[PDB]
Design an enzyme around this catalytic site. Structure first.
Site, short mmCIF file in Angstrom:
data_model
loop_
_atom_site.label_atom_id
_atom_site.label_comp_id
_atom_site.label_asym_id
_atom_site.label_seq_id
_atom_site.Cartn_x
_atom_site.Cartn_y
_atom_site.Cartn_z
N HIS A 199 24.77 3.92 -14.00
CA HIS A 199 26.12 4.18 -13.48
C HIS A 199 26.82 2.98 -12.86
O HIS A 199 27.98 3.07 -12.49
CB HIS A 199 26.21 5.43 -12.57
CG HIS A 199 25.62 5.27 -11.19
ND1 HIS A 199 24.66 6.13 -10.69
CD2 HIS A 199 25.93 4.43 -10.17
CE1 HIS A 199 24.36 5.80 -9.45
NE2 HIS A 199 25.11 4.76 -9.11
N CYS A 201 22.51 2.66 -3.93
CA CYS A 201 21.94 2.98 -5.25
C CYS A 201 21.11 1.82 -5.75
O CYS A 201 21.40 0.66 -5.46
CB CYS A 201 22.99 3.46 -6.25
SG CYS A 201 23.69 5.05 -5.74
N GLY A 215 26.43 2.12 -1.34
CA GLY A 215 25.82 0.80 -1.62
C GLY A 215 24.31 0.83 -1.77
O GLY A 215 23.68 -0.18 -2.12
#
Ligand SMILES: *[C@@H](CC(=O)OCC)[C@H](C[C@@H]1CCNC1=O)NC(=O)[C@H](Cc1ccccc1)NC(=O)OC(C)(C)C
Ligand SMILES: *[C@@H](CC(=O)OCC)[C@H](C[C@@H]1CCNC1=O)NC(=O)[C@H](Cc1ccccc1)NC(=O)OC(C)(C)C
Lengths: 306, 306
Positions: B41, B145, B143
């Site tokens: 993603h 991920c 932030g």
């Protein structure tokens, strides 16, 4: 979202852990630049602990009475001195992995990360608070002496704790990195016991702010309190008295949530008096006192879930 | 003595964390040998998340669509492929700090350490359990991920989790290091919600053993139970059914304490029915389910405080 007891990443500290042996006693030491720090009781046998004279025990040692092992590599000791309850061993090699660092003495109520170590090998990491009674509720077995506590700011390691002993209640005592004990404890066998402890009021308040920032307001109420009336209740439930300084510290969390400190105090007074009526706050059924206001600002969003 | 939620030392993992940018989206990636792993993603905008076709989004990128930063150093991307819900970016440099490692898919009930990271920079470390419902109760902000979960055995890092998203209840979902999600979740915007969760029976039992090893027997009783009668009670209080395999796993802790598993089950049945009558077990007023039998053996003394 979420809220967890979170320790600092441990890598900068792992690269400083060594093993220190004197006779048949092995424990952990901390290697920075060309110096290795460790508990001075590394020089005692079991019978020594009953009445040790450290100056007398130490003068009987040479540099080569001490072996220091970093991984598979032997460091050669080229000097030694005592500093309060620590030894400072000078070695042939500067630690290439020495981080930027400071030695700091932390204050009761403050938190730090502990790197549990055995035979110079790190095994785990967890967060502790320095209790009002100068102990920590750690988790330590035989071989753990010389394990250190620390905080990290930017890329600087602030070392604050070195582990020395366990008390009869199963809590832990040790020194700062100048070798001075936290609390009235001594590195010899006595009938010493942890004093009675208190709940850290400032931290419980910080943690209620964290619960609001994370989206929960169930425990608030329509009331306010004076500092003095709060403290009468605080004394009855064995909480530390709240001071104006603690009130000023909570300024930024107060501003972020729009909840006045004295209003949060009235909320806490009601929780103390009525219990939680079967409900939780941030997953917990009790009032948590091991997160500081700094810990909450570090971990929580800077934006309240309104 | 003591008992704490303890994470593995994080240093071997810190040296593998990088920052991955695509357009205006930045997140964390994991750099091992000459490969960088990150959530796919990273290639989406906010509007993309509403209906992304990843194959279609990816074919539109070149190697130089991706920037990878390790500390202050830019790594050059020289290849890319998708693997389930991860990207595998090939880079110009092998990571000199790559540890011995494996990729493992953990099972519900098992525990691991999480290294929370932002902009490729580690900020904290804490221990999580994989819940029966395939989520973790983590602590993550924007932030985070690409933050990873792991265990360490000897000097081998077993990576098991990469972080992808937060669910409406505030718990967390992600994938193993092959890019396959834990649970029925998908990396796109839907009405997905955590399923109903259950208490991890095996872990609660392990933790009661830990309490005995540490010296506390208050909650034991004179009774025994059959596996089947225990489970009827287990269903009423939303605990997982206990199996013979769970009984065999508890063999070594049983042997160390001299408490038969079915006798410990009768103890737990009584706690469920009567509550704890205002008492604690290892500092806790509730029944804890985030330590495995392996976690207890790792942390506790091999010698019971009888
Ligand atoms: C570090 C050194 C060691 O393991 O020695 C055993 C050969 C010890 C760490 C302790 C052990 C269990 N948990 C923990 O925190 N520290 C000690 O063993 C101290 C040494 C000492 C004795 C007397 C005064 C000061 C220091 N002893 C100790 O903690 O006593 C017990 C464990 C009996 C309560
Ligand atoms: C990692 C990426 C990120 O921060 O994007 C913001 C520009 C995010 C980590 C999240 C944020 C708060 N905690 C946490 O765990 N992950 C996300 O933002 C996911 C992206 C996503 C959307 C839809 C399907 C799958 C993945 N979104 C998300 O978690 O949604 C919220 C936070 C709104 C519940």
């Amino acid at each position: 979202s979420g809220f967890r007891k979170m320790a600092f990443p441990s890598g900068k500290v792992e690269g400083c852990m060594v093993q220190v042996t004197c006779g048949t006693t092995t424990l952990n030491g901390l290697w920075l630049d060309d110096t290795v720090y460790c508990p001075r009781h590394v020089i005692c046998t079991a019978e020594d602990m009953l009445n040790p004279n450290y100056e007398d025990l130490l003068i009987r040692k040479s540099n080569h009475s001490f072996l220091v092992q970093a991984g598979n590599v032997q460091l050669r000791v080229i000097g030694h001195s005592m500093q309060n309850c620590l030894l400072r061993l000078k070695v042939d090699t500067s630690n290439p992995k020495t981080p930027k660092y400071k030695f700091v003495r932390i204050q009761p109520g403050q938190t730090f990360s502990v790197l549990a170590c055995y035979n110079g090998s790190p095994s785990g990491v967890y967060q502790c608070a320095m209790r009002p009674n100068h102990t920590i509720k750690g988790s330590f077995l035989n071989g753990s002496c010389g394990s250190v506590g620390f905080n990290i700011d930017y890329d600087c390691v602030s070392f604050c704790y070195m582990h020395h002993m366990e008390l009869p209640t199963g809590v832990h005592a040790g020194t700062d990195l100048e070798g001075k004990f936290y609390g009235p404890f001594v590195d010899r066998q006595t009938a010493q016991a942890a004093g009675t402890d208190t709940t850290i009021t400032l931290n419980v308040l910080a943690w209620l702010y964290a619960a609001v920032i994370n989206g929960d307001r169930w425990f608030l109420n329509r009331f306010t309190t004076t500092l003095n009336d709060f403290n009468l209740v605080a004394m009855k439930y064995n909480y530390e008295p709240l001071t104006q300084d603690h009130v000023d510290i909570l300024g930024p969390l107060s501003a972020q949530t729009g909840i006045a400190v004295l209003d949060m105090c009235a909320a806490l007074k009601e929780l103390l008096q009525n219990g939680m009526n079967g409900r939780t706050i941030l997953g917990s059924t009790i009032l948590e006192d091991e997160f500081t206001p700094f810990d909450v600002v570090r971990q929580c969003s800077g934006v309240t879930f309104q």
